[PDB]
Nucleic acid binder design. Structure first.
Ligand SMILES: Nc1ncnc2c1ncn2[C@H]1C[C@H](O)[C@@H](COP(=O)(O)OP(=O)(O)OP(=O)(O)O)O1
Ligand SMILES: [Ca+2]
Length: 1148
DNA sequence: TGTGGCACTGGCCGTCGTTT
DNA sequence: AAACGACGGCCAGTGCCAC
């Protein structure tokens, strides 16, 4: 007695599926070792299909691709408020597979109401190659049976028989349910009257019986409720698991069901022959490119035309003519393209010169053609060159792409690959047939237009954005669970910050308990959190929904729906149901179109510069050795500079003091864990104060120097390693690539294969092999943190460009930096403090003068309206457009009647006041209070207006401003931050000078004050905290120092600043004092005994401090022996001396 | 470590519901 | 049948995945 589950749900039934693809497939395998089969039938989607096929196929299980369709009562177009029913479908052959793909697609594209639904119409259309089963209790026939409409059920049975023929089976399942008894009994009658054959299933949703509760809380995560609600989403029993053929019999006894329902299970599974196209199979689906031109000839054409544009001094009309005579401008390229490969290799046998360039270009074209990739290049070149001629910015390149001269020639790429040390072989390895990946950056504003170009150009049915998913992140998992358990957001957020982040994304909970000693306790305290943490790791291995790729795009060769199912996201984007890898594992052409912020920023910069001073910023024509740019990076003014804005990175650039672009390239490449540590070495060697020696490899030195000299002996770049291994070992440059992959995989002992191969070629070349083995040790060491130079170089250029703008412009530059990141309150705050500490005035927004983004009026910088926090984006434009058709706003009333509450709601209005956007109308506190009365007023004006009434009869013109007391500084500054993310103008701290007097400088004053003191001093600073390496901020600047909106006093050591002690608020305002005199630099000899005797005459026990405003820096001399007795303050302010009773610095 | 993207949720308001 | 209350989405806010 065996059995094969044909109705099984996986993790891909996103709402109620709990069976993970892996442990489900082993449980089927361990239960039935003989010819095991499993059908993936998920709720109205085909997501898992490919990964399920390839996981089951590598486990020796036979996969069956299925679909539990939502079928609409009538038409899939119905948006009726009957409903929809279930139907089990299985694909028996590949045409079957394809039809599932179409149905699953159509369900989403044509039939999506609440769920994606299909028609009995469209089922009939795509019925070829499909087996159908009568379905679960929620299906049509059993549903009709339950409703006592046996006539409708038989009529529907007939309808389906008319569609599927003998590929229709009566589906019989049994859990304890009383409805199942009635349905199956009548189903049994139908099955015998029409001679239909019953198939047993049991609609699994979890793997084993123990998973019932895990699944039951899964539902409580979608239902977003507590374990005890009630009314929380629950299944009727705990039976929906992958049962043993024995447990199946317990539900379906032999003396009542016989063997048929079981035997039919195995028979169907046998007759379900569906093969995809993965691994062994897989066809390359390269879309066709329209062109008496070969696909390979035209790519050639464009390359020759390209070089002439690319290298004007060394590749000319004259030059090409010579090459043809060695056998119009365009006519020569058209001709050179035809030259065959047997003809070409009869010239070579007869610094980057003209001839050198030809060879590299001709070589690359040779490899491209042979692999059969010229079509691929044409497609890419086409849409990039479109985007340029259509006001869409394009990055110089990303990833290995910029290594190809061809790419650069034909304008795919925009950095000279041979000026910098970029290698074609790192992009396409000539010695491995593998499809290259070409990712491209576009202006983030316009990227969609480029995708749209492709959509139109290659076909609507052939272009979609590869799909993206999503796993449940450890942090997000904790928060979602904590919500459910009725835990306050804040203490939950503290639990989420305990989990380490090792590479962008958080670590698992399983670990995060080993790695965090406090995520092994927070559990001991509360029993509530005991569950939360265990539950969150039980739910970790989960996904969100299915987005289109921020970058992923597929151009298929044949209609997408023939192989890959589709979706349409909320913005109408056509999206793949398969992810990145699944799509790529079906051999489909996948590109990345990235929206890059920096590009969008460099556009507004150019625009603003032009309008400001008539200068045409031609980024692709700028000198790359401009002094004032590097001097700015050397000063560490990286505030808005692409790629190098990290706290640490900023410090490193100040340390390095880069002088040429190559410094940026190397800095960006090495600054990462990892490699971060190699930078001090780089610097001391860069500053000509440490020899670069290769004594540890005397015989390899002849190869090492030429490679590692450029970078002071340090292997920084992946390319550097590849070359080392290619030259020392005799490896093919393409093989060295494979080696670097194998260094990265760290394959247990397959690494020892390359070792022996390395030493072999190493001896054969030079090294005595004692070096070889240890040289390989050096490679495996640096290959962990190694780098692709083409990618580094290309990106570095954007950094430069960014910095160059900031160096030379400067106001519009800053306003563009603000504009580009206007929706980030943290960055906006940052950019403002950069601008303000750079010499200009920066004003809060204003409904009468502000534009949408940062704007320059006269000689001031003025915040945009989009900068205000609760104001929508529609509202910001609305306000501005209303101000353009009617005049400037005359008063608050005039504002409120012109812009109905429909558009600028009360919440929005409030922020707008708090920002200072309406300050042109009077006192803020007064404006906030005046709101609701004037909103009532404004709403009432339209009532009279839309009831006839001219202009005097329709307006009892706006009452005065409802009175209230002016806001204090703390509360006013508090509102600003809430409304703008940052403080603008002041000053909070300047309201109580109690703290000012105790503190020991101004964040600004640190460098100036400390320099002249002892060696590596200690100091006390007070400001605000801004980090989850916390950042402290005055009204004068910020600092790195080793939660938010909490003030602190800090005792720390200075060299960078290292914290040693800290403290708190109401506590600080409780501690005190002791007499501080403030003396100028202008003090006589006969004063330092004027002041000395004044204090001598009033003893006590208060220490005396002196603020000596020096020439460069403000010193803090605490007196000596003298201890004043308080009374001295009044008698001291009774002369040209300013004094205060400040809290005593000692105590802290 | 931006940028590009996204869907999911949570904060805040009108409709629908149920209770009276 | 009228006034008082929950669910609705709303729209907005707020993190995680391949480049
Ligand atoms: N972890 C990461 N963080 C940031 N950017 C990344 C990361 N991984 C990749 N990228 C970016 C670099 C590229 O500009 C783009 C394409 O990545 P990827 O295809 O992995 O590398 P590549 O194209 O430079 O090399 P390859 O030849 O190995 O594909 O994504
Ligand atoms: Ca790539």
């Amino acid at each position: 007695l065996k059995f094969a589950h044909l109705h099984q749900h996986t993790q891909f039934s996103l709402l109620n599926g709990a069976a993970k693809l892996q442990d489900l497939l082993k449980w089927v395998k361990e239960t039935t070792p003989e010819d095991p089969a499993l059908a993936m039938t998920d709720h109205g989607n085909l997501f898992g299909a490919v990964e399920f096929y390839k996981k089951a196929t590598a486990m020796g299980v036979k996969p069956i691709i299925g679909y539990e369709a939502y079928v609409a009562a009538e038409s899939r177009f119905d948006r009726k408020r009957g409903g929809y029913f279930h139907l089990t479908l299985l694909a028996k052959d590949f045409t079957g597979y394809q039809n599932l793909v179409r149905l699953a697609s159509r369900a989403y594209l044509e039939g999506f109401y609440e769920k994606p639904r299909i028609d009995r119409e469209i089922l009939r259309e795509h019925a070829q190659g499909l087996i159908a089963l009568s379905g679960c209790l929620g299906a049509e026939i059993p549903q009709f049976i339950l409703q006592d409409r046996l006539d409708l059920a038989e009529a529907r049975l007939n309808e389906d028989l008319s569609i599927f023929g003998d590929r229709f089976f009566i589906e019989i399942q049994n859990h304890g349910l009383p409805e199942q008894k009635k349905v199956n009994q009548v189903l049994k009658e139908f099955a015998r009257k029409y001679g239909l054959g019953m198939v047993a299933t049991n609609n699994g949703h979890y793997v084993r019986k123990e998973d019932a509760r895990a699944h039951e809380v899964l539902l409580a995560i979608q239902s977003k409720t507590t374990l005890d609600d009630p009314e929380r989403w629950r299944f009727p029993c705990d039976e929906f698991y992958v049962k043993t053929p024995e447990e199946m019999r317990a539900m379906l006894p032999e003396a009542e069901w016989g063997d048929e329902p079981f035997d039919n299970t195995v028979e169907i599974a046998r007759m379900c022959d569906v093969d995809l196209p993965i691994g062994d199979k897989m066809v390359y689906r390269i879309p066709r490119f329209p062109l008496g031109r070969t696909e390979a000839q035209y790519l050639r054409e464009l390359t020759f035309l390209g070089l002439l544009r690319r290298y004007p001094d060394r590749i000319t009309e004259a030059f090409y003519r010579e090459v043809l005579r060695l056998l119009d401008e365009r006519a020569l390229a058209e001709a050179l393209a035809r030259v065959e490969e047997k003809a070409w290799e009869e010239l070579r046998k007869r610094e980057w010169t003209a001839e050198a360039i030809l060879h590299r270009a001709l070589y690359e074209l040779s490899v491209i053609e042979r692999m059969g990739f010229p079509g691929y290049f044409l497609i890419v070149q086409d849409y990039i060159n479109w985007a340029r001629g259509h006001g869409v910015s394009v990055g110089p390149g990303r990833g290995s792409a910029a290594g190809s001269l061809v790419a650069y020639a034909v304008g795919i790429t925009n950095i000279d690959p041979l000026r910098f040390g970029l290698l074609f072989e790192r992009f396409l390895n000539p010695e491995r047939v593998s499809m290259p990946d070409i990712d491209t950056d576009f202006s983030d504003r316009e990227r969609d237009r480029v995708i749209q170009y492709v959509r139109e150009r290659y076909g609507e049915d052939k272009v979609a954005q590869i799909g993206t998913f999503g796993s449940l992140a450890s942090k997000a998992a904790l928060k979602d669970v904590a919500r459910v358990y009725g835990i306050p957001h804040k203490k939950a957020e503290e639990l989420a910050k305990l989990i380490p982040v090792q590479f962008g994304k958080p670590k698992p909970l399983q670990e995060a308990f080993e790695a965090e000693p406090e995520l092994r306790a927070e559990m001991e305290k509360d029993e509530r959190i005991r569950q939360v943490i265990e539950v969150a790791m039980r739910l970790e291995g989960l996904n969100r929904h299915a987005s289109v790729h921020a970058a992923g795009v597929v151009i298929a060769a044949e209609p997408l729906t023939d192989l890959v199912p589709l979706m349409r996201d909320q913005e109408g984007r056509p999206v793949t149901q398969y992810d990145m890898g699944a799509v790529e594992a079906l051999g489909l052409l996948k590109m990345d179109f990235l929206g890059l912020r920096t590009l969008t920023f460099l556009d507004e910069a150019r625009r603003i510069v032009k309008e400001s001073k008539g200068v045409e910023l031609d980024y692709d024509r700028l000198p790359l050795d401009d002094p004032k740019t590097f001097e700015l990076l050397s000063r560490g003014e990286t505030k808005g500079v692409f790629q190098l804005e990290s706290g640490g990175m900023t410090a490193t650039v100040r340390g390095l003091k880069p002088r040429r672009l190559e410094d940026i390239i190397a800095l960006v490449s090495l600054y990462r864990p990892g490699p971060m540590e190699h930078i001090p070495t780089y610097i001391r060697r860069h500053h000509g104060q440490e020899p670069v020696s290769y004594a540890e490899f005397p015989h390899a030195e002849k190869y090492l120097r030429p490679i590692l000299d450029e970078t002071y002996g340090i292997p920084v770049y992946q390319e550097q390693i590849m070359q080392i291994a290619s030259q020392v070992a005799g490896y093919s440059l393409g093989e060295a690539d494979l080696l670097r992959r194998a260094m990265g995989k760290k394959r247990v002992e397959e690494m020892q294969k390359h070792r022996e191969r390395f030493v072999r070629g190493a001896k054969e070349r030079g090294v005595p092999e004692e070096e070889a083995n240890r040289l390989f040790d050096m490679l495996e060491a640096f290959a962990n943190y190694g780098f692709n130079k083409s990618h580094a170089a290309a990106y570095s250029l954007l950094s430069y460009q960014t910095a160059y703008v900031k160096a030379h412009y400067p106001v519009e530059f800053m306003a563009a930096l603000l504009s580009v990141e206007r929706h980030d309150s943290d960055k906006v705050a940052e950019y403002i403090r950069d601008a303000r500490a750079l010499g200009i005035p920066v004003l809060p927004p204003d409904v009468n003068r502000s534009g949408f983004d940062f704007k320059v009026v006269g000689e001031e910088i003025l915040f945009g309206l989009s900068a205000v926090k609760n104001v929508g984006e529609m509202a910001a434009r609305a306000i501005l457009e209303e101000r353009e058709r009617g005049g400037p706003f005359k008063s608050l009333g005039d504002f409120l009647k012109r812009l109905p509450e429909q558009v600028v709601n009360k919440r929005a209005l409030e922020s707008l006041v708090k920002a200072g956007a309406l300050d042109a109308f009077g006192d803020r506190a007064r404006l906030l209070a005046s709101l609701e009365p004037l909103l009532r007023w404004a709403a009432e004006t339209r009532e009279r207006g839309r009831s006839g009434l001219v202009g005097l009869f329709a307006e009892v013109e706006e009452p005065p401003l409802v009175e209230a007391s002016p806001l204090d500084e703390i509360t006013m500054l508090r509102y600003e931050k809430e409304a703008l993310g940052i403080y603008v103008s002041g000053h909070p701290v300047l309201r109580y000078p109690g703290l000012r007097e105790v503190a020991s400088c101004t964040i600004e004053e640190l460098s100036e004050f400390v320099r002249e003191l002892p060696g590596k001093p200690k100091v006390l600073l007070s400001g605000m905290v801004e980090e989850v390496r916390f950042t402290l901020s005055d009204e004068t600047g910020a600092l790195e120092v080793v939660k938010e909106d909490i003030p602190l006093l800090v005792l720390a050591e200075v060299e960078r600043v290292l914290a040693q002690a800290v403290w708190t608020l109401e506590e600080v305002l409780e501690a005190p004092k002791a007499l501080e005199v403030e003396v100028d630099h202008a003090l006589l000899d006969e004063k330092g005994a004027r002041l000395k005797s004044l204090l001598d005459e009033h003893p006590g026990s208060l220490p005396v401090y002196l603020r000596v405003l020096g020439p460069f820096g403000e010193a803090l001399f605490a007196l000596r022996e003298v201890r004043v007795g308080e009374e001295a303050l009044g008698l001291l302010e009774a002369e040209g001396y300013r004094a205060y009773l400040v809290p005593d610095r000692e105590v802290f």
